Amino acid sequence: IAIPTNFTISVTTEILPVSMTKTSVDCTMYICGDSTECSNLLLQYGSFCTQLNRALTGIAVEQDKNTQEVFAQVKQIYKTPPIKDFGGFNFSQILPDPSKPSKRSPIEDLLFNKVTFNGLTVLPPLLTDEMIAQYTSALLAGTITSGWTFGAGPALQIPFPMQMAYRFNGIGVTQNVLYENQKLIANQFNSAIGKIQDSLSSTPSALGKLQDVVNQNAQALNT
Amino acid sequence: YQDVNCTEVNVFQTRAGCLIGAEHVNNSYECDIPIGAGICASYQTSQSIIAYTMSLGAENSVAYSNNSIAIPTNFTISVTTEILPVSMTKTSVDCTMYICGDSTECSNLLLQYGSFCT
Amino acid sequence: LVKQLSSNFGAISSVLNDILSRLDPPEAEVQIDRLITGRLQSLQTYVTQQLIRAAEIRASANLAATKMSECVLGQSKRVDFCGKGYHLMSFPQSAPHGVVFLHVTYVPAQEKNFTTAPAICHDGKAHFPREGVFVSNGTHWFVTQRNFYEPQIITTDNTFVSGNCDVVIGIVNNTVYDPLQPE
Amino acid sequence: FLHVTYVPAQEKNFTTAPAICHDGKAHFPREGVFVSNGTHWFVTQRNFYEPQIITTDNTFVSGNCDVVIGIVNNTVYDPLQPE
Numbered sequence A: 001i002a003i004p005t006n007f008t009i010s011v012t013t014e015i016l017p018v019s020m021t022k023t024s025v026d027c028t029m030y031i032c033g034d035s036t037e038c039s040n041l042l043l044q045y046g047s048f049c050t051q052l053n054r055a056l057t058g059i060a061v062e063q064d065k066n067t068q069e070v071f072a073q074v075k076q077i078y079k080t081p082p083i084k085d086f087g088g089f090n091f092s093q094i095l096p097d098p099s100k101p102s103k104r105s106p107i108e109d110l111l112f113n114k115v116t117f118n119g120l121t122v123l124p125p126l127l128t129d130e131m132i133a134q135y136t137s138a139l140l141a142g143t144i145t146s147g148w149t150f151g152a153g154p155a156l157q158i159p160f161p162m163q164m165a166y167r168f169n170g171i172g173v174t175q176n177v178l179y180e181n182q183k184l185i186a187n188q189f190n191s192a193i194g195k196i197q198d199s200l201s202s203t204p205s206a207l208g209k210l211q212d213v214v215n216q217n218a219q220a221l222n223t
Numbered sequence B: 001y002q003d004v005n006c007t008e009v010n011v012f013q014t015r016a017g018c019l020i021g022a023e024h025v026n027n028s029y030e031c032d033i034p035i036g037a038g039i040c041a042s043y044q045t046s047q048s049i050i051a052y053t054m055s056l057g058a059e060n061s062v063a064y065s066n067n068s069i070a071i072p073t074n075f076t077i078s079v080t081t082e083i084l085p086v087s088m089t090k091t092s093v094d095c096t097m098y099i100c101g102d103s104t105e106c107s108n109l110l111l112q113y114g115s116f117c118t
Numbered sequence C: 001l002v003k004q005l006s007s008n009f010g011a012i013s014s015v016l017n018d019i020l021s022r023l024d025p026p027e028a029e030v031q032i033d034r035l036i037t038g039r040l041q042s043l044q045t046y047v048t049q050q051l052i053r054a055a056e057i058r059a060s061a062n063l064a065a066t067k068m069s070e071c072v073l074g075q076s077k078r079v080d081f082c083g084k085g086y087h088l089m090s091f092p093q094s095a096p097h098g099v100v101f102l103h104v105t106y107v108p109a110q111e112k113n114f115t116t117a118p119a120i121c122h123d124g125k126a127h128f129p130r131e132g133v134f135v136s137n138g139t140h141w142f143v144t145q146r147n148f149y150e151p152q153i154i155t156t157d158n159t160f161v162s163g164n165c166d167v168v169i170g171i172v173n174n175t176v177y178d179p180l181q182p183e
Numbered sequence D: 001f002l003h004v005t006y007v008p009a010q011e012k013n014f015t016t017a018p019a020i021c022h023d024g025k026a027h028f029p030r031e032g033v034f035v036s037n038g039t040h041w042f043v044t045q046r047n048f049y050e051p052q053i054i055t056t057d058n059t060f061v062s063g064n065c066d067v068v069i070g071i072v073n074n075t076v077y078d079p080l081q082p083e
């Protein structure tokens, strides 16, 4: 039998879309733009226009619904303490930056930077980017200050090393390992976060799962 | 009016377009009727229609220390409903009857189109 | 779909018998061809819409089957999969074209705050809680659960020793008595 | 998402045994594996090598010494006897 004598902690990335760009089309304008004769001829075809408009409106409302479903899961807004003291851990890469005009993390800023009239229009999303960022920051503050309790009831506070010890206990490893390798584990966690920050860019094949959505929408409109 | 300023057409300007018939409010509440770009409207009192910015909910900070914990002392058992559609209404058609109901020549003309019906 | 039969699609009429009871076959066939094109297109789009809706209904039915199997026949540990809170059990009910689940959960209500410590040093060796967390009201130290406050007296069966008192950060001195010592 | 995981790093080979016979009674570990370095027998958890002395509190007795296959003989320490 073989038994490991040392371990590593690592961090990975997972990208997956939630919504696409909603749109709408004016059937009569697109087909017979400003022509009474053409409209009169089109009147002899039934309810194709109404069917298409209903379908498009359903699509748009579904897009808003699924964005809301993904993000708005908690109502109360939490905030991180002004003093950053988590026993050696460093969340500066993921927490929002107040100095920025948009209160979003450096990683979010890099992700935002990396991604680039015949009756057809484009409608704006109901939920805005600042609101989405506020949701994300609230979730992050809740999970860093409470654990899993804020998703099952009233948020209760626990020290972060103790939360980490419980999560070690959740995979069959006793808590003394954390309690006597705290410094090393914190160093490895911070280094891994920095590595992700570096490696997120410098590769033009990571945000393809979103670039393809943008390209497909643009190509459909173009054709 | 969608995607136009209040010049071509009480009167208020929004991120989505020109809004006529509502009074803007500095306060924020929970969304009732979505409008766009974070704006919503609802019918609240003198009854009228008011447009306001969406609010995510009540702000709540937790007193995080480094040697303090919080432990529950009393519980609560609750019940919630979940609803899920399972089946749709099943139907079927007779293509030739629907297209050429009781017309031999019409059915003969339809025969020149292939296996669409099947 | 039913109402789509009243549109002439460009012909002289929208009723087949009247169309064929006034004209010769050479032109009745043109008119009939126009109507059959229109009606075939309408039927085609109806069928396509029905297929696309059937796909979504099937996805919902699969989700319902999974939920029934995993939360009516057993207790689930997937959070927010069968109601908000720690799931206990659930009941199914019938409905037109669907089901209804009555999830039964468990929600803590009243919280009070204390002070903690990752370890307890007794005689130069550290102590850790076997299950639960060390708590104190300021004058005495207890060990309790993590979801329902119930203090217990610290002793040698609630804790296990590991290492010394010079490695853990935040350790606190306290007595830990042996139950077999008074006897 | 930025998932955070745990991965073992460095392995070593050991000799194991399903059970240990002490006084005509078999012993099984409550949580862990019976491992030996070639001289002594210890019990340790599965995802982090940490040996400790086989006592009467970390194991439980069940059955006889002639049913299980691969059982070995050793000494089971008793904690309350020195006290």
Ligand SMILES: *[C@@H]1O[C@H](CO)[C@@H](O)[C@H](O)[C@H]1NC(C)=O
Pocket (backbone or CB within 6 Å): A006, A007, A008, A009, A184, A188, D009
């Ligand atoms: C175990 O491996 C981890 C992963 O790099 C490292 O942080 C730690 O220093 C290693 N332990 C040693 C070398 O004792």
Ligand SMILES: *[C@@H]1O[C@H](CO)[C@@H](O)[C@H](O)[C@H]1NC(C)=O
Pocket (backbone or CB within 6 Å): A090, A092, A093
């Ligand atoms: C945390 O990380 C930031 C940037 O990665 C660094 O400037 C800072 O010194 C680190 N430590 C603390 C305590 O903020």
Ligand SMILES: *[C@@H]1O[C@H](CO)[C@@H](O)[C@H](O)[C@H]1NC(C)=O
Pocket (backbone or CB within 6 Å): B004, B005, B006, B007
């Ligand atoms: C509409 O009016 C606003 C101000 O009322 C102005 O900023 C904007 O440029 C105008 N747009 C058009 C298309 O006239």
Ligand SMILES: *[C@@H]1O[C@H](CO)[C@@H](O)[C@H](O)[C@H]1NC(C)=O
Pocket (backbone or CB within 6 Å): A085, B066, B067, C170
């Ligand atoms: C953190 O815990 C240590 C443990 O002794 C304590 O000295 C300190 O005051 C606490 N707070 C901070 C901000 O370090």
Ligand SMILES: *[C@@H]1O[C@H](CO)[C@@H](O)[C@H](O)[C@H]1NC(C)=O
Pocket (backbone or CB within 6 Å): B073, B074, B075
């Ligand atoms: C818990 O709450 C119930 C009602 O919600 C109350 O009757 C009961 O007394 C409470 N328990 C305690 C210990 O106060």
Ligand SMILES: *[C@@H]1O[C@H](CO)[C@@H](O)[C@H](O)[C@H]1NC(C)=O
Pocket (backbone or CB within 6 Å): C121, C173
């Ligand atoms: C705990 O007790 C030991 C021995 O009496 C002592 O050396 C140590 O300083 C004590 N801890 C604190 C925090 O005073």
